[PDB]
Each structure stands twice: as structure tokens, then as C-alpha cells.
Nucleic acid binder design. Structure first.
Lengths: 156, 156
DNA sequence: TGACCAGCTGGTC
DNA sequence: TGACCAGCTGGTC
């Protein structure tokens, strides 16, 4: 074993407390799919993830659905979307507003909200390309951070 | 904001410490790709991650490469592999041994090691199907936890 | 930019 | 079991 293991065990009970808090709010694993980050976004905005959901999508008090995305700006400048983008995937996205959280490693920096109308620009681009390519799935096209900051409404 | 934000605020400094420890050992984000669990496996085994690596791969003091996988036994009983399994991916996997970490939530239970010879049973099953099926990719075929326990060497 | 490449897993009958 | 059904992202130019 490595020497740092002693530090790990010392921090552990606190990490378990975090996992417990996450469980209390519908998140089963803080170590996958940005789980530990999703929790922070939910408590700041007041949104909720329901049991039986399909991924990182949430609802507010009035029942409105939202798609949540996170980026680490210390590494990249474009938000990931789907590793197999096509019209069926886009169809799931079209009607709901998106919530974009910006992170500096682990420190939350800002949160933006974009409406479907502010995103049609990209849906049209991807759809237009999918056809041209002979119906080839697009491997993870990106949405630029600058675009989000310029067209969206800052809520944090 | 939810009243529980206050508790998150209390736990935060400890969470940042854990991310700092992970960063020192080559892990950029503890909340994705099982990063926070991977750190634990590395500290127990003494393995290290290679800068500019491809996935959760590590090496020992002699330069031997390993493939590391993790599973949450409370939720599921089959280890994930690759979302688009094919002969190209199988070629990579064939040369190295695999380390399998078993977890009950975030509590580590055991770690087993399988050699290329021990996995060949599955490699042939997959490769045959790919050739038979008309060269179509297999969507995340699983390796049962029972198989790992019965053909593996317990390391922890 | 955008366009090309790549990684980590849970759930079901 | 096997064979399906799905999710979350980073990285280079």
C-alpha cells in the first residue's frame, strides 16, 4: 500500500456523510455521471431528480422538466452532449429548457439557463449534418461555453 | 435554495481535500468515471496511473499494464465492459491482466485479479458473435461477479 | 469554432 | 447466462 492511504481513511467518514446527503436527494452514486456535482446544483436551484428518471434530468415545483449539464473549464471549453447524436436523441431534448453549470475543477463558478429557442440553432446544425453524412451518428458534438454565457440567463 | 445547502457547506472543505489528494495521484475529477473509488484501489494496491492514459489503466513498479474495473454489488451483479464491444477493443484487452474491485455502495469489499488466460473464455464468446452476427457491435456485454470470484486470485 | 478521436458505467427479462 | 435496452463526459488540431 501507498503512504497516502492513511489520509484517505481519515477523510472517509466525511465522504460517507456526503453520500448519505446525496441519497437523501435521489442520487445513488456520487462518483459517476457527475453525481457529486449534480447534488450541489439541485440544492442551489431548488430542483429535484425523481425516482425512475432516465438520466440527469430534473423537475421544479411546478412540474417543469429540465436537462442538466456540467463542464470543468480547467480542462475544456465545450459542453458534451451525446456520444451518438441523431434525430431521436434531439427529439428528447427539444421541448425542455437546459441548465448549464460551470465548474473550475470542483469549485462551482456560475449557472446559466437557456430556453429551447436559444438552442434551436444547434439542433438545426446537427440535423442538417446527420442527413448529409448519409445518416451517420455524430460522435459528441459540443456547445461552446461562450455561446451559453452570451445567449443564456445567469441564475447563479 | 434548499435548507440542506448548509450541510453541504459544512462538508465542502473535506471534499476539496479529497479532490486535492486525487489530483496528486493523477485523477482530475473524482465525480466521474468512478474517479473517487479508483483512488482507493490505487492506494491499496500501490499501482500508479500513466499521464496521458487511455481510460482507467495503471502500471506497477515493473512497467506491467493493468485494466481496472469497479462494480456496486448492491445494485448490480455484472461488470461493465465497453458500450461498443468489437474485435478492435478486444485486441487491446487481450494483452493485459484485469483488476476487479467490488463495492457495497462506497464501501470496498474485495479486489480480485484475472489473467488473460482466465478471460479468454469471454473473448471467444464475443468475437464469435461479432463475426456471426454480421459484424455488429455488442452493447456492453457483462462479466458475472460469480465468474470473477471463481476464477480469480483474491488480492484484498 | 467544428470536426475528427476516445473514456467510464446500470437495468431487463 | 446472454443478449438486449440505456446514461454521463474529455481531448486534439
Amino acid at each position: 500500500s501507498h503512504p497516502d492511504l492513511n489520509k484517505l481513511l481519515e477523510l472517509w467518514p466525511h465522504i460517507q456523510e456526503y453520500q448519505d446527503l446525496a441519497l437523501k436527494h435521489g442520487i445513488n452514486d456520487i462518483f459517476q455521471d457527475n453525481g457529486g456535482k449534480l447534488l450541489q446544483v439541485l440544492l442551489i436551484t431548488g430542483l429535484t431528480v425523481l425516482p425512475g428518471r432516465a438520466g440527469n434530468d430534473a423537475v421544479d415545483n411546478a412540474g417543469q422538466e429540465y436537462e442538466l449539464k456540467s463542464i470543468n473549464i480547467d480542462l475544456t471549453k465545450g459542453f458534451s452532449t451525446h456520444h451518438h447524436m441523431n434525430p431521436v436523441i434531439i427529439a428528447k431534448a427539444r421541448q425542455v429548457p437546459w441548465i448549464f453549470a460551470i465548474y473550475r475543477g470542483i469549485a462551482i463558478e456560475a449557472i446559466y439557463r437557456l430556453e429551447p429557442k436559444d438552442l434551436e440553432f444547434y439542433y438545426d446544425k446537427w440535423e442538417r449534418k446527420w442527413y448529409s453524412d448519409g445518416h451517420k451518428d455524430i460522435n459528441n458534438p459540443k456547445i461552446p461555453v461562450k455561446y451559453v454565457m452570451e445567449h443564456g440567463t445567469k441564475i447563479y
